[PDB]
Amino acid sequence: ASMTDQQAEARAFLSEEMIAEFKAAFDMFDADGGGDISTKELGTVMRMLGQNPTKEELDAIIEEVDEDGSGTIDFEEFLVMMVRQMKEDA
């Protein structure tokens, strides 16, 4: 109940140093910046952390994030994803 700040929920779940570790891989695609990358490549990141998802299903993830069009993605929303997975629906 009350998920008008899912964003903050992500950082609260992980530690301080744990966050810095995720930053390392984010730079692989963003040389000088480490703030925002492409949405088409975002999913590729999801798999290169240690996952097992479908390419067609990644199409859906897009609509869930920026339902209103297709802009960009940041490190904040980026943590919101990894959180959704670890929980799992079952």
UniProtKB/Swiss-Prot annotation:
Question: Which domain of life does the UniProt lineage start with?
Answer: Eukaryota
Keywords from the named record: Calcium, Metal-binding, Muscle protein, Repeat
Amino acids binding Ca(2+) 2: 66, 68, 70, 72, 77
Keyword Cytoplasm annotated: no
Q: Where does Ca(2+) 1 bind?
A: 30, 32, 36, 41
Gene Ontology MF: a single term:
calcium ion binding
- What GO biological process terms does the UniProt entry carry, in alphabetical order? skeletal muscle contraction
Signal sequence region: none
Any one cellular-component term (Gene Ontology): troponin complex
The UniProt record lists the EF-hand domain at: 17-52, 53-88
Modification Blocked amino end (Ala), positions: 1
What's the stated role of this polypeptide? Troponin is the central regulatory protein of striated muscle contraction. Tn consists of three components: Tn-I which is the inhibitor of actomyosin ATPase, Tn-T which contains the binding site for tropomyosin and Tn-C. The binding of calcium to Tn-C abolishes the inhibitory action of Tn on actin filaments.
So what family is this one in?
Belongs to the troponin C family.
Spell out the note in the miscellaneous section: Skeletal muscle troponin C binds four calcium ions.
Q: Please state what the protein is called.
A: Troponin C, skeletal muscle
Organism of origin is: Gallus gallus
